[PDB]
Design a protein around this ligand. Structure first.
Ligand SMILES: Nc1ncnc2c1ncn2[C@H]1C[C@H](O)[C@@H](COP(=O)(O)OP(=O)(O)OP(=O)(O)O)O1
Ligand SMILES: [Cl-]
Ligand SMILES: [Cl-]
Length: 312
């Protein structure tokens, strides 16, 4: 009587129904859930996420060491939501945000709501309040670690900060879903106390890390970042992405067009030279990057070709 694949589907179907779509998936499943998303600023990362970017109405955790490119991503996400006419909020407990750098990544800072809370409790209560107004497309909490309990801030023993995150996250997920607001928790590393509850509440968790220092030989242009989607409840998890961030600049589009253009074969890399349908792009990723910077026409058709092959 037993037919495994049949019984499996019935079980999987029941699992998703009792706990929500994506509670169980095959890693090679070709997801066809066009949920609304906020492009990550990185084409490869959006692909890695399987849905085109960060899902709307969900909790996102972006962790990693400092100088990994975490906030750059958070910032491109804000910029993209704003471009789509969305409103953005920034709960700041770090006081590190460089709005001039943000404007460079396309963020409309003048319209950016910023809040510099007195305590972790207040910081999350302010975020909850903004969220359940339903007016926001996205909200970024700078530093899970900086969300220190009031009691600690006023000189008091216990494990309070984690319960703080658990309780706040419990109340907030409901609002996020109804409002459709995406919440990005930036988690500078060294679990950061509240990172514990975040691990379970998140629909997406990004392991961000610095892996290289861009050269072009003998000086530095910027650094390369690698992101792994360790958790993904909307599309198969564990996929990875890489991209370049040049000093003072954000995520290099041209850089991403070159990388993906190579793996997906539209761009041919014969040794140290890059070529695109006949014409040469240059010797060394940088010259090619510079090339795509000037010959905007090319870049767009490549982007076009890469986009068509996987989804504009
Ligand atoms: N103000 C800036 N000017 C020029 N480059 C910057 C600036 N801020 C960040 N960068 C670049 C350097 C890194 O490759 C990428 C990492 O910084 P960022 O995205 O803020 O990472 P991060 O969030 O993991 O570390 P941090 O906690 O220092 O912000 O951004
Ligand atoms: Cl993007
Ligand atoms: Cl205070």
């Amino acid at each position: 009587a037993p037919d495994r694949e049949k019984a499996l589907e019935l079980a999987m179907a029941q699992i998703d129904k009792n706990f929500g779509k994506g509670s169980v998936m095959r890693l090679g499943e070709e997801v066809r859930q066009p949920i609304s998303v906020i492009p990550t600023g990185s084409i490869s990362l959006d692909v890695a996420l399987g849905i085109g970017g960060l899902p709307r109405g969900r909790v996102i955790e972006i962790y990693g060491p400092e100088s990994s490119g975490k906030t750059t991503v958070a910032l491109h996400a804000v910029a993209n939501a704003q471009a789509a006419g969305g409103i953005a909020a920034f709960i700041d407990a770090e006081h590190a945000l460089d709005p001039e750098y943000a404007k460079k990544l396309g963020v409309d800072t003048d319209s950016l709501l910023v809040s510099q809370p007195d305590t972790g409790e207040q910081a999350l209560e302010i975020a909850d309040m903004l969220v359940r107004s339903g007016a926001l497309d996205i909200i970024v909490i700078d530093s899970v670690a900086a969300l220190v309990p009031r009691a600690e801030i006023e000189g008091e023993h216990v494990g309070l900060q984690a319960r703080l995150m658990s309780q706040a996250l419990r109340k907030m997920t409901g609002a996020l879903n109804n409002s459709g607001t995406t919440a990005i928790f930036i988690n500078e590393l060294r679990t950061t106390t509240g990172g514990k509850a975040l691990k379970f509440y998140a629909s997406v968790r990004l392991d961000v890390r610095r892996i290289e220092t861009l050269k072009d030989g003998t000086d530095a242009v910027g650094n390369r970042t690698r992101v792994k989607v360790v958790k993904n409840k909307v599309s198969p998890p564990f996929k990875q992405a890489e991209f370049d961030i040049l000093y003072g600049q954000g995520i290099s589009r041209e850089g991403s067009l070159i990388d993906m253009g190579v793996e997906h074969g539209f761009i041919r890399k014969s040794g140290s030279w890059f070529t695109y349908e006949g014409e040469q792009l240059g010797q060394g990723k940088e010259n090619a990057r510079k090339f795509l910077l000037e010959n905007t026409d090319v870049a767009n058709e490549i982007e076009k070709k890469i986009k068509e092959k996987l989804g504009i």
